[PDB]
Design an enzyme around this catalytic site. Structure first.
Site, mmCIF file in Angstrom:
data_model
loop_
_atom_site.group_PDB
_atom_site.id
_atom_site.type_symbol
_atom_site.label_atom_id
_atom_site.label_comp_id
_atom_site.label_asym_id
_atom_site.label_seq_id
_atom_site.Cartn_x
_atom_site.Cartn_y
_atom_site.Cartn_z
ATOM 1 N N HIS A 43 5.821 -7.970 1.657
ATOM 2 C CA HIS A 43 6.062 -7.331 2.947
ATOM 3 C C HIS A 43 5.468 -8.110 4.119
ATOM 4 C CE1 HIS A 43 2.097 -5.143 2.186
ATOM 5 N NE2 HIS A 43 1.962 -5.460 3.462
ATOM 6 N N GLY B 1 -5.074 -5.079 7.009
ATOM 7 C CA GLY B 1 -5.145 -6.504 6.770
ATOM 8 C C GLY B 1 -5.668 -6.898 5.407
ATOM 9 N N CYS C 222 -4.226 -6.516 2.523
ATOM 10 C CA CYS C 222 -3.208 -6.772 1.518
ATOM 11 C C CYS C 222 -3.298 -8.204 1.011
ATOM 12 C CB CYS C 222 -1.817 -6.484 2.082
ATOM 13 S SG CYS C 222 -1.526 -4.704 2.181
HETATM 14 C C1 LIG Z 1 -1.472 3.534 5.048
HETATM 15 C C2 LIG Z 1 -0.165 2.897 5.479
HETATM 16 C C3 LIG Z 1 0.339 4.288 5.916
HETATM 17 C C4 LIG Z 1 0.014 2.392 6.902
HETATM 18 C C5 LIG Z 1 1.001 2.741 4.514
HETATM 19 N N1 LIG Z 1 1.049 3.661 3.375
HETATM 20 C C6 LIG Z 1 2.240 4.144 2.990
HETATM 21 O O1 LIG Z 1 3.283 3.893 3.610
HETATM 22 C C7 LIG Z 1 2.241 5.012 1.709
HETATM 23 F F1 LIG Z 1 1.982 6.231 1.986
HETATM 24 F F2 LIG Z 1 3.485 4.913 1.079
HETATM 25 F F3 LIG Z 1 1.321 4.548 0.847
HETATM 26 C C8 LIG Z 1 0.710 1.380 3.913
HETATM 27 O O2 LIG Z 1 -0.294 1.213 3.208
HETATM 28 N N2 LIG Z 1 1.516 0.387 4.265
HETATM 29 C C9 LIG Z 1 2.732 0.430 5.145
HETATM 30 C C10 LIG Z 1 3.467 -0.891 4.908
HETATM 31 C C11 LIG Z 1 2.578 -1.768 4.069
HETATM 32 C C12 LIG Z 1 1.275 -0.983 3.750
HETATM 33 C C13 LIG Z 1 0.139 -1.537 4.394
HETATM 34 O O3 LIG Z 1 -0.029 -1.384 5.604
HETATM 35 N N3 LIG Z 1 -0.755 -2.156 3.595
HETATM 36 C C14 LIG Z 1 -2.013 -2.756 4.115
HETATM 37 C C15 LIG Z 1 -2.052 -4.243 3.797
HETATM 38 N N4 LIG Z 1 -2.569 -5.081 4.697
HETATM 39 C C16 LIG Z 1 -3.240 -2.090 3.456
HETATM 40 C C17 LIG Z 1 -3.426 -0.622 3.895
HETATM 41 C C18 LIG Z 1 -3.738 -0.557 5.386
HETATM 42 C C19 LIG Z 1 -4.612 0.675 5.458
HETATM 43 N N5 LIG Z 1 -5.317 0.635 4.156
HETATM 44 C C20 LIG Z 1 -4.589 -0.102 3.299
HETATM 45 O O4 LIG Z 1 -4.921 -0.296 2.124
HETATM 46 C C21 LIG Z 1 3.769 -1.139 3.548
HETATM 47 C C22 LIG Z 1 4.012 -0.243 2.419
HETATM 48 C C23 LIG Z 1 4.942 -2.125 3.499
#
Ligand SMILES: CC(C)(C)[C@H](NC(=O)C(F)(F)F)C(=O)N1C[C@H]2[C@@H]([C@H]1C(=O)N[C@H](C=N)C[C@@H]1CCNC1=O)C2(C)C
Ligand SMILES: CC(C)(C)[C@H](NC(=O)C(F)(F)F)C(=O)N1C[C@H]2[C@@H]([C@H]1C(=O)N[C@H](C=N)C[C@@H]1CCNC1=O)C2(C)C
Lengths: 297, 298
Positions: free
Chosen positions: B39, B141, B143
């Protein structure tokens, strides 16, 4: 949750130091290796050692320093308090920016537990008010170090020497001065009664408020002197002026004055939690510093 | 008895930063390939409902900015493997450890190296929950942070971080890009299945308590494996298998407490509670230490 610092910068500094059949760990920075001085002791020596006389009988060629299986020749040796400094012929090319610090009770650090110069595990520890740490150390772990990292600089604060009969651990700063009243002799020793680290409990309460868990906030305040006198009746540490100041950032973030949080903690001490939890815990946590709260966010 | 992580240095040397457009996260650099969550190629709007094959075909090598410390690594190729992007770079990582990619099972533990902008931040121990979430500590950040175990200088990578669920637990993939659990890398509300407690780990931890001198919860009673599992399931604990009983052998041998004897102690803990007492300083029964974890530390 407890988080250790990334340990890589310290891993590349760990070596093994052997005298006779006694092997422990040492810390290789520039061209000096630091290690506990009881490496020069035989098992019988440790019962009642004369380190000054024992070190007189030692020469550079009695010390085996190895990085992995590679020997680093010892070209000089001296004792500083309870640590040995071995000058070696090779400067460690992986030496980080570093400094040596002596920490206060309540402060946390990461421990890199090592055996035979090989790192085994890493975990966060706090210095207790009775100058022990609740560590996890086995035979051969002496010379493992505790440290903090701040923007590329490693602050070494602990070197491991011994285990007390209650299962807690004692050691020195990197200048060889013990934390607490302990000595590096195999003789009956005991940690004093410990206390709860008030400043850290307060930090953890602030963390709970930041996350929206704030049922324990009450409508009272206190003075620092009044709080200190009551806290001691519950085996809690008194607060210092430095403690008040390091809570400043969290007080500003939440809009809850330090002395208001002190009054809220006082009610928790006198009345308990009545079955409720804080950050999911039924127990008040005291090994998170205000810096650990900020670092975790 | 501490939650001990593996030393993180071998993994620190592999962390890089990956940027595409205005999306930045972490990657894992092994030989001449950087692995990261796919992503990274999404805009904020794309994440709400991404068609990843369509999004990827519209990117070129030069849309990817990989930074290892201060030096940029030129991307010369790319492919997608499930939810992981693989970027071929013109430079092999000179500190690539001996490594393998493994898919772990629920109840197993690993160390997480939490990273931001390609820089390591902290290390901690996690378990794969029975519902295939992990109770991590991850911020914006994070990920591309990875989970791993180390066995005699060999790094086994088992987890890459992708997302946080509304309950605050975390979801991610193995290093082949396959999610643990029924989750997808789309920004939309997702729940996990109801979680359960990892019974074999609770037992290993009770043995750790006895090794450490905490014996108040022991009793003279004993139980059969089946009668224990009946009570365990009633309390949303995972069944204990004969493999688990065998895996606990070293700890029973060390303490001289038969596994089924320890099961009878756990059964009473479940039925009576801890009565405001603690075990190894905890008011709850801890289930994120495996038998191997206890053996290694003790
Ligand atoms: C919590 C957030 C609601 C925003 C969302 N969650 C859901 O959409 C769910 F509910 F489906 F999980 C979600 O994590 N993302 C939305 C988007 C990526 C991912 C994301 O931002 N990943 C971060 C990587 N840098 C790590 C996160 C940041 C906060 N703490 C973490 O670990 C993706 C699924 C493509
Ligand atoms: C518990 C032991 C009873 C044997 C003794 N303790 C006491 O004499 C005390 F009770 F007084 F403390 C003690 O620790 N030592 C005896 C001898 C050194 C030290 C020692 O063996 N250090 C080890 C370093 N490799 C780390 C230990 C190993 C077990 N777990 C650890 O952490 C010294 C004080 C010179």
């Amino acid at each position: 949750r407890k988080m250790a610092f990334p340990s890589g910068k310290v891993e590349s500094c760990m070596v093994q130091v052997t005298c006779g059949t006694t092997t422990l760990n040492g810390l290789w920075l520039d061209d000096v290796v630091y290690c506990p001085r009881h490496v020069i002791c035989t098992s019988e020596d440790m019962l009642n050692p004369n380190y000054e006389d024992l070190l007189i009988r030692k020469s550079n060629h009695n010390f085996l320093v190895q990085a992995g299986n590679v020997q680093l020749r010892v070209i000089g040796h001296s004792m500083q308090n309870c640590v040995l400094k071995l000058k070696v012929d090779t400067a460690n090319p992986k030496t980080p920016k570093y400094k040596f610090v002596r920490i206060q009770p309540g402060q946390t650090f990461s421990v890199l537990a090592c055996y035979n110069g090989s790192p085994s595990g890493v975990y966060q520890c706090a210095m207790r008010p009775n100058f022990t740490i609740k560590g996890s150390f086995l035979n051969g772990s002496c010379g493992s170090v505790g440290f903090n990292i701040d923007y590329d600089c490693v602050s070494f604060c602990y070197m491991h020497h011994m285990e007390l009969p209650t299962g807690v651990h004692a050691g020195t700063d990197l200048e060889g001065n013990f934390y607490g009243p302990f000595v590096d002799r195999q003789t009956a020793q005991a940690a004093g009664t410990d206390t709860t680290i008030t400043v850290n409990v307060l930090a953890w309460l602030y963390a709970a408020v930041i996350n929206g868990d704030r049922w324990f906030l009450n409508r009272f305040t206190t003075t620092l002197n009044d709080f200190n006198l009551v806290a001691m009746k519950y085996n809690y540490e008194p607060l210092t002026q430095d403690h008040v100041d390091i809570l400043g950032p969290l007080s500003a973030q939440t809009g809850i004055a330090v002395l208001d949080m002190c009054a809220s903690l006082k009610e928790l001490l006198q009345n308990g939690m009545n079955g409720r939890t804080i950050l999911g815990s039924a127990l008040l946590e005291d090994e998170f510093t205000p810096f650990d709260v900020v670092r975790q966010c």
